[PDB]
Ligand binder design. Structure first.
Ligand SMILES: Nc1ncnc2c1ncn2[C@@H]1O[C@H](COP(=O)(O)OP(=O)(O)NP(=O)(O)O)[C@@H](O)[C@H]1O
Ligand SMILES: Nc1ncnc2c1ncn2[C@@H]1O[C@H](COP(=O)(O)OP(=O)(O)NP(=O)(O)O)[C@@H](O)[C@H]1O
Ligand SMILES: [Mg+2]
Ligand SMILES: [Mg+2]
Lengths: 492, 467, 466, 82
């Protein structure tokens, strides 16, 4: 009758502050269940305690006061999902924020689903092309795999992801439907202007049409940035579970780790190394295992993950990076030195590694990659004596000349990804010695002219490498004749 | 509504309200005090009690003392009227020239411009400083960050940029002293009156000033940054025009947040910082931006704690910028001023499709040879110089001349340098380093290049340094 | 009995029983859920409350939900029909191949063997692989640190070890994957069936698989190393075997336990690790020893953080390590398989007192002759090959024939290589290497000793054609 | 408004006061000096900062052009004078 208060399905705010609402009542709330405040705001019950519930606020906490009525509405925390989202820039929860009206989404998926088990998965073997020579030949990525982008600030981390998105246009405009790749880019804790600079760079490539941009910027609240990776993941799983292929880029996980930490510290969970809670490894382990390659039993679709981690002073042994390194199937290490020295993308050939590697790259790439892996290995051992070696033997003097020239070949500008067949050709020239007499500085211009030519005159040859998926003895001889005579004419 | 002070600790004062409870962010007025004391509601503590942060000294506060709720957050004077006037944290003119007679009062707690409101257009803002314009040039309407430890030249650099840009700038400019020296502000007040940016006689003032320096209590130094940007916010949105926001220092915002963080009841994050460090900065920095409605060229001096860039506070700030200019104590140690790090400064506009492929390739080449020298430094320091070939040690003597030609006698640093200040045009800078890289100046000693303007002067100084 | 949920905080749940309380470590069944949820009692908070650590996701939990004490710790299937099965931390079969019908169920917790049940004998577990048994011998009921991950055929070496223990000693193996990547779980599963150790048809399987995957909470990752140990403990005491236990990887077991102690709210020790680190290691590593009935010999894959050996994680692990097996890229790129570094792998039982007088001098002789080879490497590349003395020319040519005889083809890899697999008995290895050192094969070529079983197959190969 | 830093190396090497010319600064600068001091100390600080650098770099036995010999000779004398 009077002051009864339905403490079972409702309650009142006992204390609000710092995006944390301690709520009285709600006796029937489930953990991780969305709630609704007087002001219309959302919140999550991340802490269930004897006398209260600690709720993380989805928005500005000014609107919540003491004694505000908190309501259960049986909400299932789920995001819009499906092909209607491609081309749109949605928020952390699927809402459109690109001013193009609502999304005609029909299917909708939970953000807190379990990863597939051991069984319904099959070994990673299909190629995932970045269009970046350095990557596809040294740190090769395949569909269903998890590969970590990891370097300091402004080391070229985003560019790697960016060039990959643009690369897909080739496959996504053609007829080969299996080889299509759908892109999902999650901005976590970034600034809006950089996220705007992003979508434009994808529009100008005509890459946006096949890209879902999930955005939770630095102004968006702590929980919003915490769900945003998972919200994108669900969107990528749609394609995976329906026989299609999707590529997701969490940019970045270091910033989600900060956004999570805040909440725990303020929900007063015990602090650990660098003030991180016990379940922050568990935060990322369940996110990144969700990427897999399904067998033809489950449609044969795949989701492919690309986490970004920002390190400070190159320290990969920081708690969060240490987590993600082990979590993932491999890493690509970008270094400041390599960057300004010229080697861009600044991929450290030494440290960078992929476990899937060999079985992920096409039989064409295999044919020239392992050779380059071995030759750059023998180069880096002697690399320090590249000038201080007048009286070195002709063997190591060849291994130095071989390396410097391959290093120039792996160089690349942004926004110009290369097809798998264009890649093997320009790598075929240096690996089989046909550049060991050319002056170091002239290599980049040759690559540009030699590639410009083979596309313009020998379409059948490159096409054959794509078709056959390998360099046959015929094509091998055909490549040798072009390189030897083009290089000779070049030096004229 | 009326409240009673139930607790006073530092700059954190708890107040209890019998009836209507005031929400978060709301400004409170403390009853019966000499100079106005504003409290800002930070938390609702329960049992009809609120935790607040005082905008001034809490000395002399009696428990039970009456406090009225102003019904809203801190609302400050905004408009053309603010120009030529020094406002403090709460918009009370600390210049001693009467009230700010404005039509509108905007709130210092506002919402960050939406994703759709964003602009992507970008052009180079020529500074006349060789180091910036060549390697990491500033974007017009862009966000500009000036990193630097204690005593390397954040302030001196931000001052030159005001001289070089704001003076000959058509639109309005907003300087905001946050947590630095009261002394530094006085100089700049008089040195912007002398120059004529601030006119004491008429309303041709181009600058609006806000100050909350290291004299003020944390609560104030935690909010005075918002007071400065809200001034800018009007000029951008309600007058469309180009704005030049200058903040020094924006790290003081984060620091003052920590000074109270423990007393609010927080488990300390890493490095004894606040856990809200990320979201506190996110709701603030995202308000400092150019939108489809108007342009804001922002320059923010960012302090570096214990000379560590990886310090959580300045390290989080990196992701909020368009162009970053980083300063080293080790570079300043060698007399190289400005002490801008050539390998640590990054611009968004360092794209040849914007600045030109000549500009780009020169700069990339400038860095490479300095980068290469850095790798040689430790090798030659123990194993002599002779072990470098005639094409290796040729780069060493070049890099040291490129290093020293990057030094520039500023027009503001006349009192320190002992030289007349120099302003070098864009094309005079690119031609400069291009020739040295080409090796056209290999005959001239390094000292010819140390502290000069254009390149002709580096030849001039050689001739004088001869006989 | 029954208890109610009083608190849900992340992966830590509190449950209030009215009458009698479950002792610490008793498993709790949360009723009315979709799948199975286990809560492990960690503390008694007073006021008839217990603090439990979940082994699965704690979403959708209602305060007051009825929780059942199982009256015992986490009980798991044990017995011969756990072989060729993928198990999880709570016993559940996660290979979708029908429920494991074992007669006995055993709790994953149990005290270490008493002082009286200890083995006063130090013996050698003959692996059949030459590099191991000669230079870095495994101690029967000891613990071996495996350095280096995949890219050198870690998975193979493991499988061959499973094959050769089952072959030579008639003892089963148990793989406990702590922090297993689900891709790598699936990949390791089919690699074991395709090679022969897991038999999806009959009962000839030699391994029991337990998977503590990464996408499982710290409770599950911290206790799965026990769930594997308990399946291995059955084959030691109930069937009296010389068992084999694989943990991959041990560091993720330490980090698992650090997370738990961080979650319960314990003040962290040095370098961020748990205060209970010493015991958290002791209470598990002391179950792995040789008893009166049988023995468990454990191969553990180690991750060292920041390549820092003084880091408490590897430092606390090393106190329990009797031998090491370094799998190296450098040796793998030369072509020597298994990719074991002969000088880098060391063993506690490399003592004339334990293995024997002969074994010792032959191993050390091989160790010295390879160091001499490295010691002459700079003199080889930069002096002139033909200017070494008779005794320096000889030891170089003898040393090359030693590192080739370390090479051994593997049974498990007959499907890939196509070449016949070898199990080289203990004394075959010792005398084989002794003869090369004594120079009895100074006339035979280098390629003769490469990828062969005993010394006999090397001389026969030396003939070939000419 | 600046700092004066002192090192034990400089102290024990002889230099007293042991002021580190490179690390110490004055934020008021010449404005705090007499026009008599400014006529002789106007550029001296940045001069010695450049000297202290080229002193440790020129100790590698490299033959030095008279222009960097001039700064070497001047820097030794002015350090003794202070
Ligand atoms: N391969 C490349 N060639 C030339 N320039 C590159 C390349 N990759 C990156 N860059 C440039 O280097 C800068 C940094 O690249 P970016 O991909 O944004 O790295 P980042 O780690 O995301 N920076 P941040 O997000 O602030 O930590 C950009 O401004 C690019 O113009
Ligand atoms: N271009 C320059 N030429 C000569 N001297 C300079 C220059 N820039 C800075 N200095 C000197 O170095 C000192 C530091 O300058 P300042 O701008 O106050 O650095 P800051 O980063 O603001 N220090 P702080 O704010 O206290 O952490 C000043 O005292 C100047 O004398
Ligand atoms: Mg980035
Ligand atoms: Mg300053």
């Amino acid at each position: 009758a009077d002051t009864s208060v339905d403490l079972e399905e409702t309650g009142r705010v006992l204390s609000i502050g710092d995006g944390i609402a301690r709520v009285h009542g709600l006796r029937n709330v489930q953990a991780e269940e969305m709630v609704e405040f007087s002001s219309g705001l959302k919140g999550m019950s991340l802490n269930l305690e004897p006398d209260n519930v600690g709720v993380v606020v989805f928005g500005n906490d000014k609107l919540i006061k003491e004694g505000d009525i908190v309501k259960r509405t049986g909400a299932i925390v789920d995001v819009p999902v499906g092909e209607e989202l491609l081309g749109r820039v949605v928020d952390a929860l699927g809402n459109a924020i690109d001013g193009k009206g609502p999304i005609g989404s029909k299917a909708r998926r939970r953000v807190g689903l379990k990863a597939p088990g051991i069984i319904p998965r099959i070994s990673v073997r299909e190629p995932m092309q970045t269009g970046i020579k350095a990557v596809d030949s040294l740190v090769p990525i395949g569909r269903g795999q998890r590969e970590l982008i990891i370097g300091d600030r402004q080391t070229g981390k985003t560019s790697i992801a960016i060039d990959t998105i643009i690369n897909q246009k080739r496959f996504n405009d053609g007829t080969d439907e299996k080889k299509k790749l759908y892109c999902i880019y999650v901005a976590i804790g970034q600034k809006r202007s950089t996220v705007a600079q992003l979508v434009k760079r994808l529009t100008d490539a005509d890459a946006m049409k096949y890209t879902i941009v999930v955005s939770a910027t630095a102004s968006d609240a702590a929980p919003l940035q915490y769900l945003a990776p998972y919200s994108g993941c669900s969107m990528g799983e749609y394609f995976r579970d329906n026989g299609k292929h999707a590529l997701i880029i969490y940019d970045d996980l270091s910033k989600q780790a900060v956004a999570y930490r805040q909440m725990s510290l303020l929900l007063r969970r015990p602090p650990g190394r660098e003030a991180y809670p016990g379940d922050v490894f568990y935060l990322h382990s369940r996110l990144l295992e969700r990427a897999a390659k399904m067998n033809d039993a489950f449609g044969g679709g795949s989701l492919t993950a690309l986490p970004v981690i920002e390190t400070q002073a190159g320290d990969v042994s920081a708690y969060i990076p240490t987590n993600v390194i082990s979590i993932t199937d491999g890493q690509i290490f970008l270094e400041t030195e390599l960057f300004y020295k010229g080697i861009r993308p600044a991929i450290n050939v030494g440290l960078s590694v992929s476990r899937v590697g060999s079985a992920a790259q096409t039989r064409a790439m295999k044919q020239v990659a392992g050779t380059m892996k071995l030759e750059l290995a023998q180069y880096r051992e002697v690399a320090a004596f590249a000038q201080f070696g007048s009286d070195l033997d002709a063997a190591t003097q060849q291994l130095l000349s071989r390396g410097v020239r391959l290093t120039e070949l792996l160089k690349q500008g942004q926004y110009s990804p290369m097809a798998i067949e264009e890649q093997v050709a320009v790598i075929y020239a240096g690996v089989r010695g046909y550049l060991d007499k050319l002056e170091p500085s002239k290599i980049t211009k040759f690559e540009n002219a030699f590639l410009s030519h083979v596309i313009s005159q020998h379409q059948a040859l490159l096409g054959k490498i794509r078709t056959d998926g390998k360099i046959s003895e015929e094509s091998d001889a055909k490549l040798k004749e072009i390189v030897t005579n083009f290089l000779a004419g070049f030096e004229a | 509504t009326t409240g009673r002070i139930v607790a006073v600790i530092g700059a954190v004062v708890d107040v209890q309200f019998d009836e209507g409870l005031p929400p978060i962010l709301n400004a409170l007025e403390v009853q019966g005090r000499e100079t106005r004391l504003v409290l800002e509601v930070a938390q609702h503590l329960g049992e009809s009690t609120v935790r607040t942060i005082a905008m001034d000294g809490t000395e002399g506060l009696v428990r039970g003392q009456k406090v009225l709720d102003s019904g809203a957050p801190i609302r400050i004077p905004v408009g053309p009227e603010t120009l030529g006037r020094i406002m403090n944290v709460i918009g009370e003119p600390i210049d001693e020239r009467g009230p700010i007679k404005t039509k509108q009062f905007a709130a210092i707690h506002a919402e960050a411009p939406e994703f759709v409101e964003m602009s992507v257009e970008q052009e180079i803002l020529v500074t006349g400083i060789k180091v910036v314009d060549l390697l990491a040039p500033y974007a017009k309407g862009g966000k500009i960050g000036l990193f630097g430890g204690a005593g390397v030249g954040k302030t001196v650099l931000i001052m030159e940029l005001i001289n070089n840009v704001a003076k000959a700038h058509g639109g309005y400019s907003v300087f905001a002293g946050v947590g630095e020296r009261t002394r530094e502000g006085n100089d700049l007040y008089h040195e912007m009156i002398e120059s004529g940016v601030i006119n004491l006689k008429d309303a041709t003032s181009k600058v609006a000033l806000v100050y909350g320096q290291m004299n003020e209590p944390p609560g104030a130094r935690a909010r005075v940054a918002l007071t400065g940007l809200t001034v800018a916010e009007y000029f951008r949105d309600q007058e469309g025009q180009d704005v030049l926001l200058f903040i020094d220092n924006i790290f003081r915002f984060t620091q003052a947040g920590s000074e109270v963080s423990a007393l609010l009841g927080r488990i300390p994050s890493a490095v004894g910082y606040q856990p809200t460090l990320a979201t506190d900065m996110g709701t603030m920095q995202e308000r400092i931006t150019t939108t489809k409605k108007g342009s804001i060229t922002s320059v923010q001096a960012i302090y570096v704690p214990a000379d560590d860039l990886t310090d959580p506070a300045p390290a989080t700030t990196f992701a909020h910028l368009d162009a970053t200019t980083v300063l080293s104590r080790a570079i300043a140690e060698l007399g190289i001023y400005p002490a801008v790090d050539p390998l640590d400064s990054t611009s968004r506009i360092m794209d040849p499709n914007i600045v030109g492929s000549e500009h780009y390739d020169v700069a990339r080449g400038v860095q490479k040879i300095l980068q290469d020298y850095k790798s040689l430094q430790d090798i030659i320091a123990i194993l002599g110089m002779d072990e470098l070939s005639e094409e290796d040690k040729l780069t060493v003597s070049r890099a040291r001349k490129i290093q020293r030609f990057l030094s520039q006698p500023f027009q503001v640093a006349e009192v320190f340098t002992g030289h007349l200040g120099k302003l070098v045009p864009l094309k005079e800078t690119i031609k400069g380093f291009q020739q040295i890289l080409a090796g056209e100046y290999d005959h001239l000693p390094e000292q010819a290049f140390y502290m000069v303007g254009p390149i002709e002067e580096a030849v001039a100084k050689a001739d004088k340094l001869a006989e």
